[PDB]
Design a protein around this ligand. Structure first.
Ligand SMILES: *[C@@H]1O[C@H](CO)[C@@H](O[C@@H]2O[C@H](CO)[C@@H](O[C@@H]3O[C@H](CO[C@H]4O[C@H](CO)[C@@H](O)[C@H](O[C@H]5O[C@H](CO)[C@@H](O)[C@H](O)[C@@H]5O[C@H]5O[C@H](CO)[C@@H](O)[C@H](O)[C@@H]5O)[C@@H]4O)[C@@H](O)[C@H](O[C@H]4O[C@H](CO)[C@@H](O)[C@H](O)[C@@H]4O[C@H]4O[C@H](CO)[C@@H](O)[C@H](O)[C@@H]4O)[C@@H]3O)[C@H](O)[C@H]2NC(C)=O)[C@H](O)[C@H]1NC(C)=O
Ligand SMILES: NS(=O)(=O)c1ccc(C(=O)N2C[C@H]3CN(C(=O)c4cc(OCC5CCOCC5)nc(C5CC5)c4)C[C@@H]3C2)nc1
Ligand SMILES: [Ca+2]
Ligand SMILES: [Ca+2]
Ligand SMILES: [Cl-]
Ligand SMILES: [K+]
Ligand code: NA
Ligand SMILES: [Zn+2]
Length: 805
């Protein structure tokens, strides 16, 4: 019930929500069916339109007008945005030359520069260049302020998951808004675009920016606008709020535009009909900037222009139907479109088998335009698994396509020519970022970055402490003139042991053998220095990684590589080696094919054994430092140490061997040397975080050797590729991956072919940030470089995407 008999007089767009069954006058009342009887008359005035004209200048205040051109309007805070231009000979903001804003220039009583966040739905990154002729106001913010060439959204690249990521700094799996449509099995309740359930607070996790501000005593303007309130009125309301007394005035504001998304769905991202929506957005920006100028706030406010995702060409005839693959199509519920999520229609049917559904959807048609996954097998860069609302079965849909259950679903529900929601690496899904104001830099381009980073920067702009989030605080310091956040490196928790020779060969009973028994103070004093770390400056270029949790481990030195060996997991946590442009690839000689050698620095009790691998019919082994890259025949024996061995499925050994024999050398030739750090990852609970030992679900049969879920590599070189990787004076360049350690290659449909036709494509799909690997290992990399820490934080958030320009 709402007793809608109260009045909105003097309450229009009130800042605190009054509780039912009393009537509301706030910018959300319409959406709740709750506005007072007189809300439209008083609060949504339209008379005479939105602009002053010559004859309106100096007029007698008619309180019925939408905006005013009377003499008292400035002090009332309610002039039309063009008032001073038409009536007082002033220029539009866009016509003025840009001039650096070195300090905030604010009216008296302003305690901090206000923040205004202007969000645009479906604003694809290439609109900045392709629509530049019809967006003069946006182009001025962009060229005079700080901009990126694009900003990467989160997966799925849908509206509500991305808006809430912008608000919280969290991945959708953590904030809980995992799609535009959801079922929560604990609640037994459904979330939908249309309807009431979405308003229930239990859906929305984390702590959004308006809540962070309020808790810390910074006043926030209500972020959300009922759809029927026109754009011109939203702008005027913001400008009116900015005229409130010091004690009542908010410090943070939000404007949201449904365009250009609304038209892009109808006409496609570049339809001729798209020019007009772009013009109209620019005009809205013009009205805001003219309005701030009137209030002498145009050199005081920080303005962010940001999108949620882009838009791709997608039509009805590019739909794959699950009815062309599955016979039992009626026993399933599909969440459809630019991604797929599958679960059982009924929890009482015990004949539903996910295993057979996956197999029926796997590599079935030569052109197949989607790929099925168990959620824990999706590329770790998507961070899309750790939530009960995300179904076990997921379909990654090719760009330009849809998935549906049956043909009837499409024709009984072509309309659309655009859509979005695809893999967040896809060029058409990228969106925009511009920052303009006293706190942002002047005329500065910054590299592409992820939208998860922005919550921290918005907190910095408002002097707030961010709630815990998935940004890396300090990685966007390079966007700001001041208010930077001075992060410090995390403290190392465990220090390494440095073992010397402590065990005799005959103390080991590992069931391993090696053909190595062949017998000079020249090459004996030589091998000693190499085991004490004489070549360590060559192979460990950025310091040793720090271990950020409590554990027992050893540093092991060798001629060609260095490792941090875990006595708990019985394998390295990390292995570091450098391969110069000049380096030579050699084979594993015949007599050394099955060679595994005890390491006399490490006890039998803390070593793997070859017997477990013989008895384990499913599991084989590989090496972290590759024997193919040994510097000499004698150095090659180090690569066969039991302390360099890791468990590998035969199917995965195909991937790993191709990477190590062919790809490392290729990257070293292309990048002028590479430094490589490789290692295992254990994420059995798919939370993106390092497992403790009691979380491991699988061991090599009849042993305590734990099986990794993934293997990583971090591949670093000099950004100035005229310098070799091991003598680099300046910025660094990185690419990394987190490969799933799977007993089959069902993921790659072309895997019966030679590795040269499919392995590199798999690696690219599983590209990763250094920061992703840090979360998954409890390690901290790049501890000792000559670069500033903020620059290193930016490097650790970099993702190599493998999309064209
Ligand atoms: C990205 O950033 C985020 C934010 O920093 C990272 O997520 C954090 O990670 C922590 C570790 O996983 C986690 O800490 C746990 O908190 C538990 C209490 O959590 C509540 O309180 C916070 C603070 O107000 C709140 O934010 C939480 O909100 C979650 O849950 C509600 C629903 O209830 C949702 O609305 C919301 O969206 C959010 O859901 C997400 O997180 C949960 C996990 O909390 C997931 O299950 C969801 O899928 C979803 O992703 C909560 O309301 C606390 O109980 C935990 O402590 C247990 O574990 C420790 C081990 O140290 C043990 O000592 C304790 O005894 C305890 O164990 C007991 O419970 C077990 C399970 O019942 C049981 O097995 C044991 O036997 C014990 O009885 C733990 O400290 C933190 O909550 C989240 N925060 C958020 C916002 O998600 C995220 O890791 C980052 N991602 C990456 C890749 O870096
Ligand atoms: N076809 S489609 O693409 O699915 C599609 C479907 C429907 C629509 C649509 O018309 N509506 C009506 C819009 C009003 N609305 C908001 O007011 C709003 C602003 C905001 O802003 C959050 C800020 C964003 C900038 O950064 C700080 C947070 N956050 C939230 C939520 C996260 C808490 C909501 C978004 C609503 C989607 N558009 C596209
Ligand atoms: Ca959207
Ligand atoms: Ca884990
Ligand atoms: Cl969805
Ligand atoms: K085996
Ligand atoms: Na295959
Ligand atoms: Zn949309």
């Amino acid at each position: 019930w709402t007793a809608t008999s109260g009045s909105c007089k003097g309450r229009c767009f009130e800042l605190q929500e009054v509780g039912p069954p009393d009537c509301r006058c706030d910018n959300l009342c319409k959406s709740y069916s709750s506005c007072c009887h007189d809300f439209d008359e008083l609060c949504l005035k339209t008379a005479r339109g939105w602009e002053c004209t010559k004859d309106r200048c100096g007029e007698v205040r008619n309180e019925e007008n939408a905006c005013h051109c009377s003499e008292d309007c400035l002090s009332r805070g309610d002039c039309c945005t063009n008032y001073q231009v038409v009536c007082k000979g002033e220029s539009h903001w866009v016509d003025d030359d840009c001039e650096e804003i070195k300090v905030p220039e604010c009216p008296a009583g302003f305690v901090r520069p206000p923040l205004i966040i202007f969000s645009v739905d479906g604003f694809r990154a290439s609109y900045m260049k392709k629509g530049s002729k019809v967006m003069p106001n946006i182009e001025k913010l962009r060229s005079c302020g700080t901009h990126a060439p694009y900003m990467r959204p989160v997966y799925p690249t849908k509206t509500f998951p991305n808006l809430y990521t912008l608000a919280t700094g969290l991945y959708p799996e953590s904030h809980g808004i995992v799609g535009n449509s959801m079922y929560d099995p604990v609640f037994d309740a459904s979330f939908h675009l249309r309807g009431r359930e979405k308003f229930n607070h239990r859906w929305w996790g984390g702590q959004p920016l308006w809540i962070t501000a309020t808790k810390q005593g910074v006043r926030a303007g209500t972020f959300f606008w009922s759809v029927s309130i026109p754009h011109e009125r939203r702008i005027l309301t913001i400008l009116q709020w900015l005229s409130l007394p010091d004690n009542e005035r908010p410090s943070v504001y939000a404007f949201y535009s449904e365009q250009p998304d609304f038209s892009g769905h109808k006409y496609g991202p570049f339809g001729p009909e798209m020019t007009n929506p772009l013009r109209e957005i620019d005009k809205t920006v013009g009205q805001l900037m003219d309005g701030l100028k009137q209030l002498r706030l145009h050199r005081c406010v920080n303005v962010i222009f940001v999108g949620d995702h882009g838009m791709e060409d997608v039509t009805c005839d590019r739909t794959e139907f699950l009815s062309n693959y599955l016979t039992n199509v009626d026993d399933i519920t599909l969440v459809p479109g630019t991604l797929g999520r599958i679960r059982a229609k009924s929890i009482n049917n015990s004949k539903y088998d996910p295993k057979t559904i996956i197999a029926a959807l796997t590599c079935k048609k030569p052109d197949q335009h989607f790929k099925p996954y168990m959620k824990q097998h999706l590329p770790k860069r998507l961070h899309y698994a750790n939530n009960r609302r995300i179904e076990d079965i997921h379909l990654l849909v090719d760009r330009r396509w849809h998935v549906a259950r049956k043909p009837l679903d499409v024709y009984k529900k072509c309309f659309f020519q655009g859509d979005h929601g695809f893999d967040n690496k896809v060029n058409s899904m990228q969106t925009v970022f511009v920052g303009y104001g006293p706190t942002f830099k002047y005329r500065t381009k910054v590299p592409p970055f992820e939208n998860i980073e922005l919550y921290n920067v918005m907190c910095d702009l408002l002097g707030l402490k961010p709630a815990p989030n998935n940004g890396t605080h300090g990685s966007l310091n390079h966007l700001l003139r001041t208010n930077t956040f001075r992060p410090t490196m995390p403290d190392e928790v465990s220090r390494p042991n440095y073992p010397g020779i402590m065990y005799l060969q005959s103390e080991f009973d590992l069931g391993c053998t090696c053909d190595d028994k062949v017998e000079n103070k020249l090459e004996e004093l030589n091998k000693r220095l190499h085991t004490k770390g004489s070549t360590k400056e060559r192979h460990l270029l950025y310091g040793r990684p720090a271990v950020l949790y409590r554990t027992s481990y050893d540093i092991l030195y060798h001629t060609d590589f260095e490792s941090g060996y875990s006595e708990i997991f019985l394998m390295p946590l990390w292995t570091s080696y450098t391969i110069s442009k000049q380096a030579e690839v050699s084979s594993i000689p015949e007599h050394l094919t099955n060679c595994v050698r005890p390491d006399v620095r490490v006890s039998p009790g803390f070593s793997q054994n070859c017997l477990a691998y013989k008895n384990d019919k499913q599991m084989s082994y590989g090496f972290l430092f590759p024997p193919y890259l040994s510097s000499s025949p004698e150095a090659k024996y180090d690569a066969f140490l039991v302390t360099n061995m890791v468990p590998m499925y035969p199917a995965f050994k195909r991937v790993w061997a191709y990477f190590q024999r062919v790809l490392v050398k290729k990257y070293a030739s292309e990048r002028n040397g590479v430094n490589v750090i490789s290692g295992p990852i254990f994420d059995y609970n798919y939370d993106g975080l390092r497992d403790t030992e009691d979380e491991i679900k699988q061991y090599v049969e009849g042993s305590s050797i734990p099986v990794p879920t993934h293997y990583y590599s971090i591949i670093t070189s000099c950004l100035d590729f005229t310098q070799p990787a091991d003598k680099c004076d300046g910025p660094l360049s990185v690419s990394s991956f987190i490969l799933p350690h799977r007993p089959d290659n069902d993921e790659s449909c072309n895997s019966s072919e030679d590795e040269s036709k499919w392995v590199e494509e798999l690696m690219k799909m599983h590209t990763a940030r250094v920061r992703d690997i840090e979360h998954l290992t409890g390690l901290d990399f790049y501890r000792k470089t000559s670069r500033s820490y903020s620059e290193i934080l930016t490097l650790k958030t970099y993702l190599h995407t493998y999309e064209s320009e």
